[PDB]
Amino acid sequence: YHVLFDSYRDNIAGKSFQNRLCLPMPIDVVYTWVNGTDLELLKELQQVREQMEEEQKEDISASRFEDNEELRYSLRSIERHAPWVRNIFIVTNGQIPSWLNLDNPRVTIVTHQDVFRNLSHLPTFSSPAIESHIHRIEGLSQKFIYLNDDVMFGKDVWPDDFYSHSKGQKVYLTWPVTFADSLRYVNKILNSKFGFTSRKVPAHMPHMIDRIVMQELQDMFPEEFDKTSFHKVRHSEDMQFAFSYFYYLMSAVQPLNISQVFDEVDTDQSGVLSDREIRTLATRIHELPLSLQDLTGLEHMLINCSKMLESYYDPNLPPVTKSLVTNCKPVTDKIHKAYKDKNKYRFEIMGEEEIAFKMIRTNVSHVVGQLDDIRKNPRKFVCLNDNIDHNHKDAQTVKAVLRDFYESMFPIPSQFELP
Amino acid sequence: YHVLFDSYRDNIAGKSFQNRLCLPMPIDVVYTWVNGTDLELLKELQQVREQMEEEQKAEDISASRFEDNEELRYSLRSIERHAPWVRNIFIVTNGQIPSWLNLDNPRVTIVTHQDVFRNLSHLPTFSSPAIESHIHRIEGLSQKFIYLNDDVMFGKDVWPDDFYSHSKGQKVYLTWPVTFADSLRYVNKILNSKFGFTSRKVPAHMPHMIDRIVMQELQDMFPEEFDKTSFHKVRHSEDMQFAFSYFYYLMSAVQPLNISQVFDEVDTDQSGVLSDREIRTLATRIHELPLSLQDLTGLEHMLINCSKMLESYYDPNLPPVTKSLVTNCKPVTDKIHKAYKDKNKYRFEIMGEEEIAFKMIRTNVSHVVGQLDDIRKNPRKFVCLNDNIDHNHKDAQTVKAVLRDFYESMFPIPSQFELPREYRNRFLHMHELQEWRA
Numbered sequence: 001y002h003v004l005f006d007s008y009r010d011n012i013a014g015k016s017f018q019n020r021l022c023l024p025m026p027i028d029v030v031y032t033w034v035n036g037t038d039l040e041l042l043k044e045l046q047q048v049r050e051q052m053e054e055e056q057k058e059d060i061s062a063s064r065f066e067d068n069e070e071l072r073y074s075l076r077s078i079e080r081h082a083p084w085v086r087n088i089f090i091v092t093n094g095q096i097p098s099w100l101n102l103d104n105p106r107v108t109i110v111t112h113q114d115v116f117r118n119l120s121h122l123p124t125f126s127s128p129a130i131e132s133h134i135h136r137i138e139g140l141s142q143k144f145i146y147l148n149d150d151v152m153f154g155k156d157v158w159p160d161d162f163y164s165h166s167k168g169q170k171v172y173l174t175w176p177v178t179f180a181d182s183l184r185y186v187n188k189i190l191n192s193k194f195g196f197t198s199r200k201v202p203a204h205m206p207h208m209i210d211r212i213v214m215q216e217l218q219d220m221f222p223e224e225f226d227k228t229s230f231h232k233v234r235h236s237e238d239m240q241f242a243f244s245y246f247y248y249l250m251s252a253v254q255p256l257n258i259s260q261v262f263d264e265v266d267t268d269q270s271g272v273l274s275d276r277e278i279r280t281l282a283t284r285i286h287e288l289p290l291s292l293q294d295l296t297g298l299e300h301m302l303i304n305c306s307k308m309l310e311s312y313y314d315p316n317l318p319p320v321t322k323s324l325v326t327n328c329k330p331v332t333d334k335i336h337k338a339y340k341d342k343n344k345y346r347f348e349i350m351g352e353e354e355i356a357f358k359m360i361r362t363n364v365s366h367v368v369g370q371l372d373d374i375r376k377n378p379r380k381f382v383c384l385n386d387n388i389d390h391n392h393k394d395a396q397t398v399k400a401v402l403r404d405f406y407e408s409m410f411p412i413p414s415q416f417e418l419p
Numbered sequence: 420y421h422v423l424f425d426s427y428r429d430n431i432a433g434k435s436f437q438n439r440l441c442l443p444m445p446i447d448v449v450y451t452w453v454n455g456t457d458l459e460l461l462k463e464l465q466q467v468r469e470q471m472e473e474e475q476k477a478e479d480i481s482a483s484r485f486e487d488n489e490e491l492r493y494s495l496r497s498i499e500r501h502a503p504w505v506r507n508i509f510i511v512t513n514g515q516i517p518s519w520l521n522l523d524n525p526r527v528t529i530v531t532h533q534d535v536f537r538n539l540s541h542l543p544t545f546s547s548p549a550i551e552s553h554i555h556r557i558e559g560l561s562q563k564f565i566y567l568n569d570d571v572m573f574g575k576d577v578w579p580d581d582f583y584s585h586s587k588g589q590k591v592y593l594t595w596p597v598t599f600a601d602s603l604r605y606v607n608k609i610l611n612s613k614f615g616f617t618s619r620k621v622p623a624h625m626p627h628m629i630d631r632i633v634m635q636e637l638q639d640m641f642p643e644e645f646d647k648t649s650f651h652k653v654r655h656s657e658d659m660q661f662a663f664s665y666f667y668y669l670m671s672a673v674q675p676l677n678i679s680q681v682f683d684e685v686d687t688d689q690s691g692v693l694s695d696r697e698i699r700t701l702a703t704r705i706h707e708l709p710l711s712l713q714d715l716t717g718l719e720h721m722l723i724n725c726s727k728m729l730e731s732y733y734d735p736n737l738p739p740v741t742k743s744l745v746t747n748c749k750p751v752t753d754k755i756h757k758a759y760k761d762k763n764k765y766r767f768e769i770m771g772e773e774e775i776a777f778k779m780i781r782t783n784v785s786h787v788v789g790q791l792d793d794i795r796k797n798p799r800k801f802v803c804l805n806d807n808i809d810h811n812h813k814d815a816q817t818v819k820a821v822l823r824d825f826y827e828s829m830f831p832i833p834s835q836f837e838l839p840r841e842y843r844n845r846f847l848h849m850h851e852l853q854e855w856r857a
């Protein structure tokens with residue numbers, strides 16, 4: 001209300017910090033949904049025949065394209081635990097769920113036609129290739145949550161669970177470093193670019209993605225992401241969606257700005273460094289404990305720069321202006337050496353305590369046990385990956401168990417369902 | 420206006436979640452400040468003379484407990500620079516008024532011990548814990564407020580995210596396991612008696628965010644010893660520490676188990692009757708994994724028996740499992756109590772001491788200079804310079820000068836709460852000002 005709006009300027013500064021107190025909104029959810037239809041196996045079988053026909057002179061296991069009713073219950077989980085989401089985007093080959101309520105303005109189907117920039121990759125059948133273009137959806141919010149169609153919210157989620165203005169995005173990591181091969185390939189690329197370091201793969205969970213950061217990452221590696229889009233099957237040489245994005249967010253650096261250093265040392269907004277400001281600059285430049293020798297050396301460097309181009313204790317010291325510091329080679333050299341490289345983005349490394357990731361390894365008793373483990377300990381993010389044979393007789397029993405578990409957690413039909 | 424208001428209703432639910440997204444507002448700052456005036460020194464000598472005659476029948480008074488090292492001025496400057504979101508500032512001054520304070524500013528207010536203590540029988544307080552025991556009683560104070568110690572200040576840049584988050588509650592900054600140490604041990608024994616034995620760590624010397632409701636509940640839970648620490652006229656060995664008690668009440672307040680809530684969180688159908696899937700969820704919650712068929716069968720047998728005493732299930736004789744049937748079923752409720760461990764009433768988030776700068780100013784120039792340089796090299800969110808100066812050594816003046824120079828390097832620009840250097844408050848006490856008005 002008007003009283004609520006004026007309350008933001010009711011502080012000592014007489015200014016509104018609503019953009020700094022209210023979390024980044026609006027936020028959208030993007031899904032990648034694939035189904036094995038009558039016209040999808042036919043196009044799938046065209047590619048598989050030409051894969052092994054040339055190289056001599058497993059990825060495609062039907063668990064990559066099978067519906068276990070996971071999208072419907074993921075949408076129900078969003079409606080139940082994340083009611084703050086604005087719009088839902090479902091990215092498909094043109095397949096539309098038989099139960100999806102297209103008349104609902106909040107949910108839209110986005111075909112690969114509108115997503116891929118170069119349409120010579122339309123028969124995709126590859127999650128990394130589709131995900132590399134997931135940030136190009138028209139009308140997408142700058143902050144959006146990418147859902148993997150197996151992941152869903154289990155307990156309750158708020159934008160604070162992904163992003164904080166103070167510490168930036170939350171990065172949930174797991175065990176260190178086709179999926180493993182792609183992880184190692186991206187790890188080598190990041191070692192070449194940002195330097196050698198140890199990395200840990202992000203958890204299987206809804207990922208918050210910034211469109212600007214993702215676009216900058218893809219501009220930094222145009223050829224790698226073009227190759228990722230080119231492939232029609234998950235390959236060892238494609239950029240993993242979450243690993244590359246999060247370890248670019250955590251590794252991107254910003255060039256040091258001497259003007260910013262001067263402004264943050266010159267605390268009185270005068271443009272000239274006083275004795276105290278020179279002292280704090282010397283402290284930030286040299287290595288503690290500070291001695292009179294270091295301060296005298298800094299004074300000598302400033303005096304020499306002045307000769308070769310308020311009141312002070314040293315009578316020979318000129319007024320230390322921003323120009324005198326920026327145009328001084330040794331002082332700027334010391335600034336560049338002492339100041340460690342700063343990250344362009346803020347991030348907060350988290351743990352996997354609130355993430356329930358489980359693989360459905362076609363065993364009815366074990367599947368029931370792990371679903372019961374989810375039931376007893378409700379976690380914030382739940383992932384149920386498909387490792388079923390889909391030809392075994394137990395496959396239908398496993399699907400029934402999963403459907404019963406889903407119905408137990410989310411029985412109420414969502415607004416995205418045809419009545 | 421309306422465009423901004425309609426933004427929060429633009430979601431799948433169609434509701435506004437602004438209260439869950441936009442942090443707790445407003446937030447106020449409370450200061451406790453004391454000056455070594457002649458009038459205060461006269462009352463100080465009365466207590467110490469009576470203090471000596473008490474111990475003869477069978478330091479908490481030293482000047483470092485009361486001396487003004489100009490820390491309040493630079494703390495207000497730090498608030499104006501790094502925490503511009505604060506609404507109002509309250510200073511509890513023992514009736515005094517800082518000479519440089521600009522009382523004409525409507526965002527700074529002097530509150531005296533008269534309006535703070537419950538009864539006026541121990542007004543000559545001279546004890547920080549006693550004054551802190553009534554901080555939450557300030558009229559017009561916001562529900563969540565940050566208590567400033569007049570020598571702690573904001574160092575880098577702070578936001579309400581550094582104190583509170585809706586998802587994870589208040590942030591608790593703990594440093595190391597447990598007169599100040601004696602008070603910590605006393606409160607630790609009290610908490611061991613009340614909430615049970617555990618390992619505890621003292622909160623950091625920093626701006627502490629306090630909720631008025633939580634503090635009032637804590638003081639209602641321990642009325643006798645809070646009144647005891649209230650009526651002490653000197654910092655005492657056995658008194659309730661302000662931050663330790665509040666934070667380990669926030670982290671230890673448990674809430675009694677509610678069977679209706681458990682049923683509602685298991686009955687996801689919102690129908691009032693547990694289905695077979697919901698009964699399996701309840702069995703998983705109660706029993707220890709793996710959930711054998713024997714355990715579920717036993718649960719079903721217990722439900723059937725207790726139904727006999729007073730949507731098609733697998734058991735044809737199993738009645739509809741209603742909420743009333745579960746609440747009136749003694750064995751399943753006992754097993755729920757034995758399985759569901761006690762949940763905390765308040766949500767909190769334990770933090771580290773990485774962004775906290777706490778140092779002891781132990782009247783050595785070569786060491787104070789090094790410590791302040793360490794602050795200069797590595798800015799931190801919260802900086803505390805705790806007074807430990809000898810105050811009779813010749814180096815006290817030089818140490819004060821070094822501290823003032825460090826403060827001026829950090830915050831040179833005068834704040835909005837200061838009078839111009841050519842002006843000064845006419846009266847240094849509230850009662851004199853009231854006499855001047857009337």
Ligand SMILES: CC(=O)N[C@H]1[C@@H](OP(=O)(O)OP(=O)(O)OC[C@H]2O[C@@H](n3ccc(=O)[nH]c3=O)[C@H](O)[C@@H]2O)O[C@H](CO)[C@@H](O)[C@@H]1O
Binds near residue numbers: 091148242
């Ligand atoms: C939560 C998480 O970290 N998920 C990652 C995981 O997925 P995972 O290994 O679980 O890959 P899935 O088989 O679940 O496929 C991932 C997603 O791609 C979709 N899909 C798949 C094939 C297809 O032709 N069309 C289509 O849209 C699925 O519907 C699903 O939404 O490893 C993949 C390969 O590194 C990544 O791409 C995924 O982001």
Ligand SMILES: CC(=O)N[C@H]1[C@@H](OP(=O)(O)OP(=O)(O)OC[C@H]2O[C@@H](n3ccc(=O)[nH]c3=O)[C@H](O)[C@@H]2O)O[C@H](CO)[C@@H](O)[C@@H]1O
Binds near residue numbers: 513567660661805806
């Ligand atoms: C940041 C922090 O955790 N500080 C705690 C620390 O303070 P510490 O041991 O540093 O206590 P100080 O000497 O700084 O005094 C604390 C506060 O009380 C004020 N004061 C003191 C004496 C007096 O007669 N009037 C008056 O108003 C001071 O101005 C200051 O605001 O240990 C005390 C022991 O109980 C606690 O109470 C303080 O909360």
Ligand SMILES: *[C@@H]1O[C@H](CO)[C@@H](O[C@@H]2O[C@H](CO)[C@@H](O)[C@H](O)[C@H]2NC(C)=O)[C@H](O)[C@H]1NC(C)=O
Binds near residue numbers: 067096098
């Ligand atoms: C996913 O693909 C399957 C397989 O094509 C679809 O199931 C078909 O649905 C149509 C329309 O109702 C029926 O006429 C066919 O008999 C079904 N085929 C099979 C093999 O079951 C299904 O509708 C697609 N969509 C979803 C959301 O699962």
Ligand SMILES: *[C@@H]1O[C@H](CO)[C@@H](O)[C@H](O)[C@H]1NC(C)=O
Binds near residue numbers: 118119120
């Ligand atoms: C699209 O990709 C194909 C891959 O063969 C390439 O030949 C073509 O040039 C690309 N199109 C554009 C417009 O870059």
Ligand SMILES: *[C@@H]1O[C@H](CO)[C@@H](O)[C@H](O)[C@H]1NC(C)=O
Binds near residue numbers: 363364366369
């Ligand atoms: C299925 O899991 C159970 C334990 O739940 C195990 O004993 C059994 O051997 C598994 N069956 C197969 C075929 O691997």
Ligand SMILES: *[C@@H]1O[C@H](CO)[C@@H](O)[C@H](O)[C@H]1NC(C)=O
Binds near residue numbers: 454456487847
């Ligand atoms: C503290 O009290 C002394 C005692 O005379 C007085 O001179 C001084 O102005 C007071 N200080 C402040 C900061 O108000």
Ligand SMILES: *[C@@H]1O[C@H](CO)[C@@H](O)[C@H](O)[C@H]1NC(C)=O
Binds near residue numbers: 541
């Ligand atoms: C002041 O405090 C208590 C209540 O907190 C009151 O009953 C008591 O009489 C007063 N103290 C003394 C010493 O009379």
Ligand SMILES: *[C@@H]1O[C@H](CO)[C@@H](O)[C@H](O)[C@H]1NC(C)=O
Binds near residue numbers: 678680
């Ligand atoms: C349990 O929670 C419900 C929520 O509606 C509340 O009405 C009820 O009083 C609670 N039961 C108790 C406190 O015994």
Ligand SMILES: *[C@@H]1O[C@H](CO)[C@@H](O)[C@H](O)[C@H]1NC(C)=O
Binds near residue numbers: 783784785786
């Ligand atoms: C102050 O510390 C220095 C070393 O930092 C030491 O040499 C000196 O003796 C100390 N002075 C006192 C009075 O303790």
Ligand SMILES: [Ca+2]
Binds near residue numbers: 270
């Ligand atoms: Ca200056």
Ligand SMILES: [Ca+2]
Binds near residue numbers: 694
């Ligand atoms: Ca039910």
Ligand SMILES: [Mg+2]
Binds near residue numbers: 063064065066
């Ligand atoms: Mg799948």
Ligand SMILES: [Mg+2]
Binds near residue numbers: 150384385386
């Ligand atoms: Mg998956």
Ligand SMILES: [Mg+2]
Binds near residue numbers: 483485806
């Ligand atoms: Mg003090």
Ligand SMILES: [Mg+2]
Binds near residue numbers: 568804805806
């Ligand atoms: Mg102190």
